[PDB]
Design a protein around this ligand. Structure first.
Ligand SMILES: Nc1ncnc2c1ncn2[C@@H]1C[C@H](CNS(=O)(=O)NC(=O)CCCC[C@@H]2SC[C@@H]3NC(=O)N[C@@H]32)[C@H](O)[C@@H]1O
Length: 266
C-alpha cells in the first residue's frame, strides 16, 4: 500500500557505520546503496576482482534482480526490507562444515527480530535450510554462495514488505503486528547477532547447533522434501548432522539431504 511508504524511512548509513565499525566489532566496511541488481552478486564480483571481502557489509535499499536458491529469484520494493550481503573468509574451516554457516545466519536473523513481536504466534522459528518463518509465512530468506576463499551470505528480511508485493507465502514484521519497525535498529542487531554466530561457527562452538535445534520448526515435524531434480521424499525430520544436512526418518530408514525445499506437513 502507499501508506506503508510512510512506514519506510531510509537507512542511516553513518549511524550504522558508527555502531558497527570500530573496536570490539569484526565488520571492516559497510555501505548502503540506493539500488542494485543483487547484493550477493555485487560482493561476489568484488571478490572475483581481488577484493578482500571478509567482514565487508553491503546493504541495498532496493534490489531489482534478487537471487534465491536453485536459480530462483527474490522480490523486493524500495525500503521495505533489510537487504544485505556479508563476506566471510572460510578457507580456515574444513569444507564439510561450511553448510552450518548458512544455518547460523538464519539463527542470527531470527534472534534479531524475535523480541519485537508482542506474542510469538505458532509456526515461528527456523525451517531448514534457510527460512525464517513466522505464523507459517516466510519472514526472511538466506542465500549462501561460494567464491574462494570466501562465502557470501545474503539476507532478505521482510520488515514492512507486503506479501502482495512479493510472494503469497511471505510475511513481514508489520504483518506480524509490529506497528513501527525501525530498520536501523534491526539492521544493527542483525549484524551484531551475525558476527557472534560466525565466530561460533568458525570455532565449532557446540552452542551454535544447540541454539539452532531450539528454534527449529523442521526437526520433529512430518515433512515433504523436494530434492534437486524434482523428486519428493516424505518422512519425519529428526536431526541436523555436522555438515548441516537434514536427517530424515523414512519408515525406519535414514535419508540425509544436503539440499532441498522443505514443506511442513500435518
Ligand atoms: N520478499 C520475499 N519474501 C518472502 N518470499 C519471497 C520473497 N520474494 C520471493 N519470495 C519467494 C521465495 C522463493 C525463493 N526461496 S529460496 O529458494 O529458498 N531462496 C531464498 O529464500 C534465498 C533468498 C535470498 C535473498 C537475499 S536478499 C540479499 C541477497 N542478495 C540476493 O540477491 N539474494 C540475497 C521465491 O523467490 C519466491 O518468489
Amino acid at each position: 500500500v502507499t501508506d506503508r511508504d510512510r512506514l519506510r524511512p531510509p537507512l542511516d548509513e553513518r549511524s550504522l557505520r558508527d555502531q558497527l565499525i570500530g573496536a570490539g566489532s569484526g565488520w571492516r566496511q559497510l555501505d548502503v546503496v540506493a539500488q542494485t541488481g543483487s547484493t550477493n552478486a555485487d560482493l561476489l564480483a568484488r571478490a572475483a576482482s581481488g577484493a578482500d571481502i571478509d567482514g565487508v557489509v553491503l546493504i541495498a535499499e532496493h534490489q531489482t534482480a534478487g537471487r534465491g536458491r536453485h536459480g530462483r529469484g527474490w522480490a523486493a520494493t524500495a525500503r521495505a526490507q533489510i537487504i544485505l550481503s556479508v563476506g566471510v573468509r572460510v578457507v580456515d574451516v574444513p569444507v564439510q562444515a561450511w553448510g552450518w554457516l548458512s544455518l547460523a545466519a538464519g539463527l542470527a536473523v531470527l534472534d534479531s527480530v524475535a523480541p519485537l513481536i508482542a506474542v510469538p504466534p505458532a509456526e515461528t522459528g527456523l525451517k531448514w535450510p534457510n527460512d525464517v518463518l513466522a505464523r507459517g509465512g516466510k519472514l526472511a530468506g538466506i542465500l549462501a554462495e561460494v567464491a574462494q576463499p570466501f562465502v557470501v551470505l545474503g539476507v532478505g528480511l521482510n520488515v514492512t514488505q507486503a506479501p502482495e508485493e512479493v510472494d503469497p507465502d511471505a510475511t513481514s514484521l508489520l504483518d506480524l503486528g509490529v506497528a513501527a519497525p525501525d530498520r536501523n535498529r534491526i539492521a544493527s542487531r542483525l549484524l551484531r547477532e551475525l558476527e557472534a554466530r560466525i565466530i561460533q561457527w568458525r570455532n565449532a562452538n557446540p552452542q551454535l547447533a544447540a541454539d539452532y535445534r531450539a528454534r527449529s520448526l523442521t526437526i520433529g515435524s512430518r515433512v515433504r522434501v523436494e530434492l534437486p531434480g524434482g523428486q519428493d521424499v516424505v518422512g519425519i525430520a529428526r536431526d541436523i548432522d555436522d555438515q548441516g544436512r537434514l536427517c530424515l526418518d523414512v519408515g525406519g530408514r535414514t535419508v540425509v539431504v544436503s539440499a532441498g525445499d522443505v514443506v511442513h506437513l500435518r
